[PDB]
Amino acid sequence: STGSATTTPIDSLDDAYITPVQIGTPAQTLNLDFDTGSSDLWVFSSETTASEVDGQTIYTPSKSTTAKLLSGATWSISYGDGSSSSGDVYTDTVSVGGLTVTGQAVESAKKVSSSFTEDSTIDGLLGLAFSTLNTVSPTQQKTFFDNAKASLDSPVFTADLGYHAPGTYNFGFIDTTAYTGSITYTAVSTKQGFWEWTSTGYAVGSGTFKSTSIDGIADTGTTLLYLPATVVSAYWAQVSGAKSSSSVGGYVFPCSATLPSFTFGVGSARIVIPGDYIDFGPISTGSSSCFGGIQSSAGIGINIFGDVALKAAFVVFNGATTPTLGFASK
Numbered sequence: 390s391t392g393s394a395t396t397t398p399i400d401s402l403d404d405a406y407i408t409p410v411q412i413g414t415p416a417q418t419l420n421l422d423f424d425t426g427s428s429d430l431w432v433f434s435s436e437t438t439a440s441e442v443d444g445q446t447i448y449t450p451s452k453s454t455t456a457k458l459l460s461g462a463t464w465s466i467s468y469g470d471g472s473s474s475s476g477d478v479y480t481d482t483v484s485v486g487g488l489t490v491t492g493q494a495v496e497s498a499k500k501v502s503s504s505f506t507e508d509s510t511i512d513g514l515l516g517l518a519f520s521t522l523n524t525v526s527p528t529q530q531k532t533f534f535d536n537a538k539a540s541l542d543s544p545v546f547t548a549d550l551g552y553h554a555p556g557t558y559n560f561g562f563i564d565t566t567a568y569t570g571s572i573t574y575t576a577v578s579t580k581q582g583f584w585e586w587t588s589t590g591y592a593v594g595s596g597t598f599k600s601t602s603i604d605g606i607a608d609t610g611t612t613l614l615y616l617p618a619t620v621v622s623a624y625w626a627q628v629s630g631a632k633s634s635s636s637v638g639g640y641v642f643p644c645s646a647t648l649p650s651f652t653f654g655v656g657s658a659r660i661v662i663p664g665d666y667i668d669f670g671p672i673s674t675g676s677s678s679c680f681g682g683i684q685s686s687a688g689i690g691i692n693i694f695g696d697v698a699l700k701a702a703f704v705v706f707n708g709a710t711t712p713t714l715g716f717a718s719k
């Protein structure tokens with residue numbers, strides 16, 4: 390089998406991407422944030438504290454003839470960005486772009502943190518990291534990809550995120566029309582439960598490439614590119630007036646600037662992030678200070694190849710016995 394679904398930016402900045410997911414019988418379609426950095430499929434629901442729902446579409450298990458309470462199971466997740474959610478668990482039929490999994494754990498939120506409530510466009514998350522990170526207790530549950538894997542034509546999914554435009558998540562096949570050149574594959578460590586890999590270096594604009602190993606995760610659920618402070622300083626030093634602002638929470642730059650590109654290495658290959666992808670717009674409405682899309686990972690504890698980086702590539706998440714990642718230009 391295969392599946393193919395379009396993923397759409399939630400706003401004009403590409404702050405996140407939403408993909409429609411069918412849950413239950415008859416189907417209830419929720420728009421979920423596909424997150425290769427976590428491993429829980431959780432949804433706003435009829436059980437979510439009413440004061441914490443503000444415009445989201447909810448899953449109502451009582452209206453699904455295939456929903457079954459997973460008795461005794463609870464979940465609770467705290468994401469690296471400070472957001473969190475928790476609740477109980479149903480199993481139900483879940484379909485993405487025509488690919489169906491029966492008996493998928495659908496984690497129903499009873500509580501969500503304010504950042505989820507405030508984002509009316511995101512009805513939940515669909516985790517695509519390794520199932521070892523799934524938070525369901527006392528019986529850990531599998532991700533949608535892990536449940537589908539054996540049925541897929543090939544044990545892979547691909548992320549093709551757009552810049553200020555829709556893109557695609559494919560399951561079970563590699564669309565050879567979706568990228569240019571060849572796909573360069575690179576090794577993955579699953580020891581922390583992430584799609585963790587090592588970039589071979591970087592360049593800033595037209596500058597020379599610096600060969601240096603940068604360990605980090607391929608995370609479709611993180612908006613920006615978080616890299617070591619040395620790398621980030623070298624980037625922003627090429628932008629007149631850019632500075633790190635403790636009051637804003639990262640690097641800002643004059644909105645009048647034209648940003649340089651940023652290149653990262655995948656083996657001997659190179660992915661180029663155009664400068665425009667690094668502009669996240671005014672820090673507050675009407676400001677002439679703009680927020681940078683490349684930020685320091687100092688204090689996060691891990692480097693994160695988030696959407697800013699991934700949207701510059703066609704990315705293969707290869708879930709073969711030994712997982713690997715593939716990157717192609719597009």
Ligand SMILES: NCc1cccc(NC(=O)c2ccc(F)cc2)c1
Pocket residue numbers: 424425426427468469470471608609610611689693
């Ligand atoms: N998408 C799941 C996932 C996995 C690992 C790390 C994070 N994110 C962070 O740690 C983070 C912290 C501070 C920031 F400003 C931005 C991101 C998220």
